[PDB]
Paper text:
The KRAS oncoprotein is a frequent tumor driver in lung, pancreatic, and colorectal cancers and has proven to be a challenging pharmaceutical target. The first KRAS‐targeted therapeutics are now being tested in clinical trials but the consequences of preferentially targeting the GDP or GTP state of KRAS and the relevance of RAS nanoclustering have remained unclear.
Numbering used by the authors:
A (entry chain B): 11 to 174
B (entry chain A): 1 to 176
Write the structure that this text describes.
Amino acid sequence: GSDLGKKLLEAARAGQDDEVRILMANGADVNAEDTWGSTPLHLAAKTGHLEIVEVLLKTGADVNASDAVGHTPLHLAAHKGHLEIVEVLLKTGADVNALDLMGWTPLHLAARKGHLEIVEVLLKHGADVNAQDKFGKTPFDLAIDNGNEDIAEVLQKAAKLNDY
Amino acid sequence: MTEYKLVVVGAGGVGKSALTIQLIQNHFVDEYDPTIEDSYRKQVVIDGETCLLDILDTAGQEEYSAMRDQYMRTGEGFLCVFAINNTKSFEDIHHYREQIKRVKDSEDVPMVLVGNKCDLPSRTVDTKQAQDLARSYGIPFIETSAKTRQGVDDAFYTLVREIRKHKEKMSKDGKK
Ligand SMILES: Nc1nc2c(ncn2[C@@H]2O[C@H](COP(=O)(O)OP(=O)(O)NP(=O)(O)O)[C@@H](O)[C@H]2O)c(=O)[nH]1
Ligand SMILES: [Mg+2]
Ligand SMILES: [Mg+2]
C-alpha cells in the first residue's frame, strides 16, 4: 500500500523476515518506493538480507527497478559484496549490465570493491568486460586502480576467451 | 515522525560520501574503500522532534541530466560541500547553488555551506571568505571533518532546521 508500502520498506531494510511475510499477506505493494526510489528489494539487497530478497522475488518484485541514482538491486548487492543475493538476482532475470549515473555496471562495482567471486559470477551471466564508465574506464581498469590484481587477471582472461 | 529529504552536492573528492557515511555508520572511509552514489536513512532527535533523514549522496559532476534534475526537484534541502584544501571546489559552490535554484525555480531553497577536511594540517581556502559567501547567500556555514567527525551532525541537523524554518515561513504565507 502506502501505509503498508512504507512498513514493507522498513521491514525489508531491518531484516524482519516474519514482518515482511505478514505485510505481503496483507497486500503490501511489493514495489513500493521510498523517497529516493528504493523498493523493498533494493533495501533487502543492500543490507544483505537474502531470505527477504528471495521472498520478494517470488512475490512479484521488479528485479530491475532503478533508484534515484540509477542503481538496481544487483548493483547494490555487487557493491556490498553479497554473493548469494547476486546469484539469486541473476537467476531471476536481473540485467547483468544495468548502468548507473556514473556509467557503472555491476561488474565495475564488484571490480572496484575487490569482490572476486561476484566478478566470476557476473562474467558467467554475460557481464560486459568492455563496458566503459563516464570516465572511459572498464572494470579491468578499475580493478587496477583499486589494486585488485586477482580480479584484473580474471577480467583479462575473460576478455581473451571472448575475443576468440 | 517528520521526514526530511536531504541532498549532498559539491565537486568531486570534497568528502560528500565521507560526511554521509560518518553520519550514518560512524565510519570514516579512506582512499581505499570505494563509494557509490547512494541513499541513506537516519532516525534522530532534533530540538525535541523525532526526525527521519532521507539522505541522497550524489557525485560531483558537470552534466545536464534528467535524473539529476529530478532528485533536485524532490530534495527539500541541500548541503553544498567544498574542501578547505581545494580552491576550485570553493569556486564551484556558486554553480551548485545556481543549478539548484534554477531547477527548483526558487530563490529560497534550504541550504547549508559546508567546508570539509578541517582536520588537515593546513588549508587554501580562507574561513572568512567562506563565512562572507554564506552570509551573502543568507545561509549557515559549517566547518566539518569527516575524519574526526567534527561538525558532521551539525551540518545535517542545521540543514533540517533550515528546512523547518522554510516550511514555517510558507505556512505564514499560506493563511495570510
Ligand atoms: N583528511 C580528510 N580526508 C577526507 C575527509 N573527507 C573525505 N576525505 C578523503 O577525501 C577523499 C574523497 O572523499 P569522498 O568522500 O569519496 O568524496 P566525494 O565528495 O564523495 N567524491 P565524489 O563526488 O566522486 O562522490 C577520500 O580519500 C576521503 O578519505 C576529511 O574530512 N578529512
Ligand atoms: Mg561520493
Ligand atoms: Mg533514504
